[PDB]
Amino acid sequence: KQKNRPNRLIVDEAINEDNSVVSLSQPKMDELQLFRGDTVLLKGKKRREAVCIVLSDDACSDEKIRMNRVVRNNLRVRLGDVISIQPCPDVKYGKRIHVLPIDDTVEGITGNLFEVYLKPYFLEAYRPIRKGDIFLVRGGMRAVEFKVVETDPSPYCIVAPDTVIHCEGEPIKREDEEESLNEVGYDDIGGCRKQLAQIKEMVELPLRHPALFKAIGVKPPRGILLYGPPGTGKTLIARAVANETGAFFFLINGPEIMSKLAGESESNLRKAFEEAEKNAPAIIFIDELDAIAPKREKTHGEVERRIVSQLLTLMDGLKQRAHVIVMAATNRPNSIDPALRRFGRFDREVDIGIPDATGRLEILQIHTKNMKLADDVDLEQVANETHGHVGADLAALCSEAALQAIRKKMDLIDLEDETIDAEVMNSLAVTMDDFRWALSQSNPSALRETVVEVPQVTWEDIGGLEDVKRELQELVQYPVEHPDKFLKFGMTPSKGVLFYGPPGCGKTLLAKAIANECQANFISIKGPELLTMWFGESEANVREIFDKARQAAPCVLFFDELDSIAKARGGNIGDGGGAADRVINQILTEMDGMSTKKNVFIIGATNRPDIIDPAILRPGRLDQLIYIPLPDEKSRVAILKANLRKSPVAKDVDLEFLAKMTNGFSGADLTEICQRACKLAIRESIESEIRRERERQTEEDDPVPEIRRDHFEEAMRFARRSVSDNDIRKYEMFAQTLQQSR
Amino acid sequence: NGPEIMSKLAGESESNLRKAFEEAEKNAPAIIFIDELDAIAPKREKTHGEVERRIVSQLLTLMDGLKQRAHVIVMAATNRPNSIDPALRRFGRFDREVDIGIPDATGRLEILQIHTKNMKLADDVDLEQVANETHGHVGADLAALCSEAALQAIRKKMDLIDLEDETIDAEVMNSLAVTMDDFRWALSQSNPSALRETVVEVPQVTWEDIGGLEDVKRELQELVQYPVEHPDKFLKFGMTPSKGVLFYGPPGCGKTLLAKAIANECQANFISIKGPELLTMWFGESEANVREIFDKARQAAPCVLFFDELDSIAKARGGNIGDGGGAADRVINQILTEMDGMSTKKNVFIIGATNRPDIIDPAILRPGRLDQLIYIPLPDEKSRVAILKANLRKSPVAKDVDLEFLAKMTNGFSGADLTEICQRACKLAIRESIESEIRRERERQTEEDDPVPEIRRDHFEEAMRFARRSVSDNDIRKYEMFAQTLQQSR
Ligand SMILES: Nc1ncnc2c1ncn2[C@@H]1O[C@H](COP(=O)(O)OP(=O)(O)NP(=O)(O)O)[C@@H](O)[C@H]1O
Ligand SMILES: Nc1ncnc2c1ncn2[C@@H]1O[C@H](COP(=O)(O)OP(=O)(O)NP(=O)(O)O)[C@@H](O)[C@H]1O
C-alpha cells in the first residue's frame, strides 16, 4: 500500500479562524486529487479522526498543513507531528443531532443556549461533524464549548438547513484527557513574530525529542533571559511555549520567595528544582529575577546574599541534565547580578520590545475577539492613534470600551423594567464613540523610550534625487547580498556615509526610505539627545545605543544634527578649545570597535560641514561624503506633486507655473505653502457652515470641497525664502575645495 | 568553589573550609583549587557584613599554616588582579601570577579543531576562514558556535525528513555531515562576541608591505635588535642603550606599519593605544589607568608599546595658540612618571608618533625617555612604484597597465592617498561586473563568457580623474623648518 508520499503532512499554525477549514498548498491538492470544498478525513494520534472542508493557499510548503487549534486539539496531535489525510466522499446530510455543554464553561449563563449560540453558528454554512468532537462558539463576551453526543447518519455527517437539533439535557463533565481551550497558545499572542520564531527554534529539540540527547554528546542551550518594559506579556509567552510543547511548567516568583523566613525560602527554592527535575521534560520560570538577584552592592543585608548564592549553585548543578530548561524575565539586562549572565547560567537573551502599528492592530483584534462590535468601528484608526501603548494598555482600552457600553445604555435603561441575561447581552453592541471616549481620556501611555521598527516612508515620497538614490543603492544593498565579488577582489566595503547640504532639503527622508527598501530596522538619534548627554556629562549612554543596534541587526543607525555640540560651544570662532568633544569621541571609540560583518549601516547628517571634527572622515568611519543640493524646476514639480497627492485639489491649478516662480526655494518651504492653503480652505469651510447654521436656524450645496486657484494665490503672497546666496556660495566653496585637505 | 561555600550557615561554611584542607593534606601530593576567589574574598570595604570577614581571616590562617608542608599546592582563579583582598597577594600566600588571556587567530583555529574532532564535516568547510572572522571570541564562544552548527544540521535536515518514515540511530547520524552554510548561519547571527578589551599578540604585517624606507628600516634594526642579543659590547664600553623613539612627519606616510613590522620581525608582542583612549582618560579625568597599561606591557615581556596620536590632547585644548595654560597636561605627565620608573633591562621598547612635532611637551625629549627622533618624509617616484606594487599585489590586475607612468604622474602624493586609488578602481570594477551579471540574468531569463575578471586601464583612468592631494606645500615647508632648525633648542 502507498502511504508515505501521497498521504503524509506536518502540522503547523493557521491563518484562518474557521473551525472546519483546513488550508494546504495547490501542488499537494492536485497530487491528492482533491478539489476545493471537498470534505477530507484526517487521522492522528490515538486512532482519532476528523472531517473537515479543505481550502487552498500559497504561503505554504509542499508538506505542511495548516489547521486551527480546535481541530488540532481534536486529534490529540501537537505542532510538528504527522497525520494522515484521505478523501471521504460518502458523507450525508443529518436528520437528528444532540449536543451538550461543558459545565466548566457555562457559569452564570442564564436563559436558553440554543437560540443565542447554536442558531447563528449553523446558519447558511454547511459544516461537517463527527460524533464525539468538541467545538467552540464565541459571543456575549464569553466563549462557550459544545460536545456532540449523537448523529443520525452515525458516526459523521454534514449539517444541512433541515437538520433538527435536540439541545436537551444537562451539562457534561470535562474528563482528564482533553485540555481546556481557555488556556494560552501561540494564537493568543499579538505581534512579536521574530522573537517567537527564535524561542520556538531554541527549545524545539530538547522538549520534543528528549531521547535524542542520549545518543549524541551535544549540549543544548539551557539559559534563556527575556527582557522588555513591564506590560509586554512575558509570562504569557512562557505559558504559551510550555503548553504547545506539552512540557511541564513550574512557576517561581520573586516577592513570594522574599516574603518568607530564611530557612523556608531556601527550602522552597530547593524543592522547586527537585520537583521540576523529577517530571521530565520541564520548564522552570523565574519572573522578577531583578528582585531576588539584584546587583551585589544593592544587597545591603546578609540573607539576600545567601539566596543569590543558593540560586547560583542550583543553576550550576544543571549543566549535566539536559531535560530541564530555565527561563527568566527582567526589565533591562543591566539590572541583575553580573555573575548570572555567563556561560552555563543565562547565555541566551531575547528582547520583546514595544509593538509596531501592525502588531497593535493584531493585539486589538485579539482582545475584541468575542465582543460584537458595530459596523462603523474601524480598528485601523485606533491602531494608528495609540503610539506608545503596550499590550496591557490595549487590553485595558478594550475593557474600558466594553464597560462604558454596558454602563451608558442597557443597564440603567432596563433597571426599571427587568433583569439582565445572555440574550440582551449578545444583542449589545459597542460603537466607535465609546472607543473615542476611552482613547481620549484615562489612558496614560507608559512609554518615553526609544522605538525601533521598519519605517513607512518610501521612494515615492521624495521628488528628485536620482543620482543620490542610485549611489545609496550601490552603497547599502550590494555587499549584503553578493559577497562573491568582494572576496574575489579582496576589497572590503565601507560602513558609513555623511550627508551634507543646505537645511531643509530632505536628508531624513533618504535615510528612512533606504531603511524601508531593504526592510531593515531604523533607529534615529536627534540633536537634543546628544545635547542631553553633553550637558548632563554622561556620555556612558552611547554604549547602550550601539548595543540595541547590534541586537536588532540588520539595522540603520541615523545621527542627524551632528554639528549640534560643535555649535553649542560657540560658532566657528568657538571657545578657546579645539574641535574634540566628549560624545563624538565616544562615537568614534564605539564605532571603530565593532564587527566587520554585522550588517549595521551608520549614517550622519550635518548642514555645517566645516566645523565638524575631521577625525571622523578617516577610513573605517564615515568616509563617503554625499552632497544634497537645492532643487531645480524639474524636481520642484515632483516635490509639489508628492506633497499634494494626499489632499483633494482641483484641476484648474497649473503646477508648472508655481514651480518656475519659486527659484532657490528649499523643499521644506514648498511644503508649508500647501499647509497654508489648506488652513485657508478649512477657515472658509467652517465660516460658510456657521453662516448656514446661523442664517435660517436662528440644502446640501457644498461651498467648496477642495482647494482652488485663489487659495493658492492668497497663500503664495506669504512666500518666504529660507537660505541666502552667501550660504550657497559657502557650500560651493566647500564643494570646489573638497580636495587638498585630509 | 565560592557560591557553594557562601550559601551555607556560618559554622557549616567554616567547617567545610577546614575539612577541605585536612582531607586534601592527608592524601599526598595534592592540589587544591579555589575558583571564584573574588566572591569569597573581596576587598575589605566591600565586606559590609561580619561573617564574611571571619571567612576571609579563616582563609588567611589556613593559607599561612601551609608554609611548612611542601606537598600541597593551592591554585585559584579570578578575573583581574585588583578585584581581591590585597592581603592575599603577598609572599607565602599567592606569589605566582599567570594571565591566560584571549586567543589569537592560530589559537582560534586550534580550538575549532579541538571541538569538531568527531563531527564529520564536509569537504567545502574551510576552518581558516572561520578562524579569521571570529575576532573577539573566547573558547566558550567557539564551543557554542560548533554546537549551534551541529544542532542546525540535525534540525534543518534528517529529523523532519525521517519523522514521517522511521526512527533515528547511529548509522544515520554517522552519515550526517555539516556544511559551510550552517557555519555561516551560526557565525552571522546569535553570536555576541563578549570582548571590548585590549588585545596583545604578534602582528601579521611584515617588511614586504612597506614600499621604500630603507635607511629608516636599517636604523630601526640597530635601535631594537642589537642590545637584546649582544650585551657584550654594551658592558665592555659601559654605555647603556636607549629605550624610546619618536617618529614624525606628514600624516598618512606609514608610521604604524613600521611599528607593526619591527614587532613582527623580533617576534615580540605588540600593544597599541590610539588617540581616543587618551582622550577618554582626559575628558573622564581618570589618568589612573596609565598604571594598568604599563603593567600589561611588563607581564607580557618582550613587547612593543606604541603610542600614536600623541598630540591629540595638545590639539584638543586649542591649536598652537591653545588656552591660557602651558604645555603640561595630566595624562602625558602620568606617562613620564610611569616611564621613568621602570626596569633598565626588561626588554620593553616604547615608540611614539606625532605629525605636529612642535606642540608636544619638550620634557619628553630628555634622556631616559623618547630621545631618538626619526623623520618619515613624503615618498619619491622610486618609492611610489614600490608602494603601488605592494598595494596591488593582493588583487588581480591586468598586464597592459604601466605603473611607472602612474607613479611619476602623482608628485607630492602621500602613501595613504595612493591606497585609495586602488580601492576606487576595484569599486568601479565590482559595479561593472554586477551590472553585466544582472544584464545577462534579465536579458533572456525574463554561456560562461566572463565580462572582465580583473582591472584594466580604463578603470584606472576613471578613478585617476578623482585624484586628490592631502598635504599642502606650506605644511612641507613647516616640517622642513623644524628639520633644518633641529639644532639649538633643547
Ligand atoms: N526633496 C524632497 N521631497 C519631498 N519632500 C521633501 C523634500 N525636501 C524636503 N521635503 C519635506 O521637508 C520636510 C522637512 O525636511 P527634512 O526631511 O526634515 O530635511 P532636514 O533638513 O533633514 N530636517 P530640517 O533641517 O530640520 O528641516 C519633510 O518632512 C518633507 O515633507
Ligand atoms: N610607505 C608605505 N608603504 C605601504 N603602504 C603605505 C605606506 N604609507 C602609507 N601606506 C598605507 O597607508 C595606510 C594608512 O597609513 P598609516 O600607516 O596609518 O600612517 P599614519 O599616518 O600613521 N595613520 P594616519 O595618520 O591616520 O593616516 C596604511 O594602512 C597603508 O596601507
Ligand SMILES: Nc1ncnc2c1ncn2[C@@H]1O[C@H](COP(=O)(O)OP(=O)(O)O)[C@@H](O)[C@H]1O
Ligand atoms: N503581545 C500580547 N499579546 C496578547 N496579550 C498581551 C500582549 N501583551 C500584553 N498582553 C496582555 O496584558 C497582560 C500583560 O502580561 P503580564 O501582565 O506581563 O503577564 P501576567 O499578568 O499574565 O503574568 C496580559 O494579561 C495579556 O493578556
